[PDB]
Scaffold this active site. Structure first.
Site, PDB file in Angstrom:
ATOM      1  N   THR A 158      51.364  32.162  41.074  1.00 29.50           N
ATOM      2  CA  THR A 158      51.515  33.188  42.129  1.00 29.50           C
ATOM      3  C   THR A 158      50.184  33.725  42.621  1.00 29.50           C
ATOM      4  OG1 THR A 158      51.745  35.080  40.687  1.00 29.50           O
ATOM      5  CG2 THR A 158      53.783  33.834  41.210  1.00 29.50           C
ATOM      6  N   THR A 159      49.065  33.267  42.067  1.00 28.82           N
ATOM      7  CA  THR A 159      47.729  33.618  42.578  1.00 28.82           C
ATOM      8  C   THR A 159      47.038  32.313  42.906  1.00 28.82           C
ATOM      9  OG1 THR A 159      46.679  33.562  40.417  1.00 28.82           O
ATOM     10  CG2 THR A 159      47.579  35.664  41.164  1.00 28.82           C
ATOM     11  N   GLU A 161      57.079  40.530  41.364  1.00 27.35           N
ATOM     12  CA  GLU A 161      56.818  39.364  42.231  1.00 27.35           C
ATOM     13  C   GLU A 161      58.165  38.710  42.523  1.00 27.35           C
ATOM     14  OE1 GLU A 161      53.424  37.091  40.460  1.00 27.35           O
ATOM     15  OE2 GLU A 161      52.489  38.138  42.147  1.00 27.35           O
ATOM     16  N   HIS A 181      50.004  38.577  31.233  1.00 28.36           N
ATOM     17  CA  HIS A 181      49.507  39.611  32.157  1.00 28.36           C
ATOM     18  C   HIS A 181      50.696  40.220  32.871  1.00 28.36           C
ATOM     19  CE1 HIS A 181      49.886  35.960  34.506  1.00 28.36           C
ATOM     20  NE2 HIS A 181      50.264  36.802  35.479  1.00 28.36           N
ATOM     21  N   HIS A 202      41.836  41.063  39.066  1.00 28.19           N
ATOM     22  CA  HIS A 202      43.173  40.882  39.710  1.00 28.19           C
ATOM     23  C   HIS A 202      44.267  41.489  38.831  1.00 28.19           C
ATOM     24  CE1 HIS A 202      41.097  38.234  42.413  1.00 28.19           C
ATOM     25  NE2 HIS A 202      40.732  37.443  41.401  1.00 28.19           N
ATOM     26  N   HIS A 221      52.007  42.203  36.831  1.00 28.76           N
ATOM     27  CA  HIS A 221      51.867  42.586  38.248  1.00 28.76           C
ATOM     28  C   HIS A 221      52.607  43.896  38.415  1.00 28.76           C
ATOM     29  CE1 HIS A 221      50.572  38.373  39.205  1.00 28.76           C
ATOM     30  NE2 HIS A 221      51.367  38.133  38.136  1.00 28.76           N
ATOM     31  N   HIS A 279      54.279  38.325  32.836  1.00 26.71           N
ATOM     32  CA  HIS A 279      54.197  36.851  32.846  1.00 26.71           C
ATOM     33  C   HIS A 279      53.549  36.393  31.546  1.00 26.71           C
ATOM     34  CE1 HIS A 279      54.347  36.764  37.473  1.00 26.71           C
ATOM     35  NE2 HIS A 279      55.562  36.914  36.900  1.00 26.71           N
TER      36      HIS A 279
HETATM   37  N1  LIG Z   1      50.980  34.770  38.007  1.00 27.63           N
HETATM   38  S1  LIG Z   1      51.122  33.406  37.252  1.00 27.63           S
HETATM   39  O1  LIG Z   1      51.785  33.590  35.972  1.00 27.63           O
HETATM   40  O2  LIG Z   1      51.743  32.437  38.109  1.00 27.63           O
HETATM   41  C1  LIG Z   1      49.596  32.775  36.875  1.00 27.63           C
HETATM   42  C2  LIG Z   1      48.542  32.691  37.850  1.00 27.63           C
HETATM   43  C3  LIG Z   1      47.271  32.143  37.552  1.00 27.63           C
HETATM   44  C4  LIG Z   1      46.973  31.659  36.273  1.00 27.63           C
HETATM   45  C5  LIG Z   1      45.598  31.015  35.988  1.00 27.63           C
HETATM   46  O3  LIG Z   1      45.465  30.481  34.936  1.00 27.63           O
HETATM   47  N2  LIG Z   1      44.565  30.807  36.773  1.00 27.63           N
HETATM   48  C6  LIG Z   1      43.183  31.118  36.416  1.00 27.63           C
HETATM   49  C7  LIG Z   1      42.717  29.672  36.333  1.00 27.63           C
HETATM   50  N3  LIG Z   1      43.419  28.999  37.446  1.00 27.63           N
HETATM   51  C8  LIG Z   1      43.947  27.692  37.052  1.00 27.63           C
HETATM   52  C9  LIG Z   1      42.821  26.690  36.932  1.00 27.63           C
HETATM   53  C10 LIG Z   1      42.426  25.960  38.070  1.00 27.63           C
HETATM   54  C11 LIG Z   1      41.398  25.015  37.979  1.00 27.63           C
HETATM   55  C12 LIG Z   1      40.769  24.804  36.739  1.00 27.63           C
HETATM   56  C13 LIG Z   1      41.160  25.531  35.600  1.00 27.63           C
HETATM   57  C14 LIG Z   1      42.189  26.479  35.693  1.00 27.63           C
HETATM   58  C15 LIG Z   1      44.527  29.908  37.879  1.00 27.63           C
HETATM   59  C16 LIG Z   1      48.017  31.650  35.316  1.00 27.63           C
HETATM   60  C17 LIG Z   1      49.276  32.172  35.633  1.00 27.63           C
HETATM   61 ZN   LIG Z   2      51.462  36.434  37.043  1.00 29.36          ZN
END
Ligand SMILES: NS(=O)(=O)c1ccc(C(=O)N2CCN(Cc3ccccc3)C2)cc1
Ligand SMILES: [Zn+2]
Length: 257
Positions: A195-196, A103, A91, A61, A93, A116
């Site tokens: 956001t994902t 975003e 990371h 992603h 986008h 981010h």
């Molecule tokens: N674009 S953003 O900065 O908003 C962003 C999006 C996703 C993530 C992220 O950490 N994810 C992968 C894991 N999941 C979280 C997770 C769920 C269950 C167990 C454990 C962890 C999402 C971090 C920042």
């Molecule tokens: Zn992000």
């Protein structure tokens, strides 16, 4: 099977993640005339001098630069935050073209990309517990515009050839994320979400007003990455952004006049 294609893109995510249509989703448009200056907000404290980067990962992603978060080394405090938030990863986008990729938007303006820097509230003990809390994460968002090169980004650009496809990682030690910041820490802040998928409503968003400049050559190298795994049909990693979501019952606050 979520992603950024016609068949699995942001308009589809609500079928597996119904919180996609929730009350505090991200990103949002920042209407600069309706954001109110909040004189009670504190200056941001970005303490990255002891940051320990470990690895860079193509997750299918985006790419994540991961940090050692087993101690208070790189932390975000102050601003709208109560307590201490530890840096775990950053990371970006980005777009297929310089006219899109961010975003968040500013008065409906899209930037070429958005950084981010992800942090978790140390009162919850680990990142997995923090994402289950309404104040679990703080994400520092920084816009990228195309113009002069960002010297502090080039070490990231130069390793991307080694993580072209999904699941590839590379050692990425001694990277200083201070080299990605703009001069000003003026910001907007509002309560939002990842956001994902899984789109959890666990984020305090802090979006800097001042964009960083990167070169056309730097962002062209982001767009040579692949969503696909090795030996699969090539799909360029571009347009990995979610569009702006309804603001609903939320107020965006400004740190500045
Ligand atoms: N674009 S953003 O900065 O908003 C962003 C999006 C996703 C993530 C992220 O950490 N994810 C992968 C894991 N999941 C979280 C997770 C769920 C269950 C167990 C454990 C962890 C999402 C971090 C920042
Ligand atoms: Zn992000």
């Amino acid at each position: 099977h979520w992603g950024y294609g016609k068949h699995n893109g942001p308009e589809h995510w609500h079928k597996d993640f119904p919180i996609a249509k929730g009350e505090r989703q991200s990103p949002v448009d920042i209407d600069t005339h309706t954001a109110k200056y909040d004189p009670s907000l504190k200056p941001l404290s970005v303490s990255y001098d002891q940051a320990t980067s470990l690895r860079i990962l193509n997750n299918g992603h985006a790419f994540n630069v991961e940090f050692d978060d087993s101690q208070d080394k790189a932390v975000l405090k102050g601003g709208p935050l109560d307590g201490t938030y530890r840096l775990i990863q950053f990371h970006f986008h980005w777009g297929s073209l310089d006219g899109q990729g961010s975003e968040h938007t500013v008065d409906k303006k899209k930037y070429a990309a958005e950084l981010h820097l992800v942090h978790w509230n140390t009162k919850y003990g680990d990142f997995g517990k923090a994402v289950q809390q309404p104040d679990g994460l703080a994400v520092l968002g920084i816009f990228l515009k195309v113009g002069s090169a960002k010297p502090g980004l080039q070490k990231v650009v130069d390793v991307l050839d080694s993580i072209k496809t999904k699941g590839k990682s590379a050692d990425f030690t001694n990277f200083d994320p201070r080299g990605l910041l703009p001069e000003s820490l003026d910001y907007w802040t509002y309560p939002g979400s990842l956001t994902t998928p899984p789109l959890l409503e666990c984020v305090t968003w802090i979006v800097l007003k001042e964009p960083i400049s990167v070169s056309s050559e730097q962002v062209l190298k982001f767009r040579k990455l692949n969503f696909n795994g090795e030996g699969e049909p090539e799909e360029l990693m571009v347009d990995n952004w979610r569009p702006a979501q309804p603001l609903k019952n939320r107020q965006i606050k400004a740190s500045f006049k």
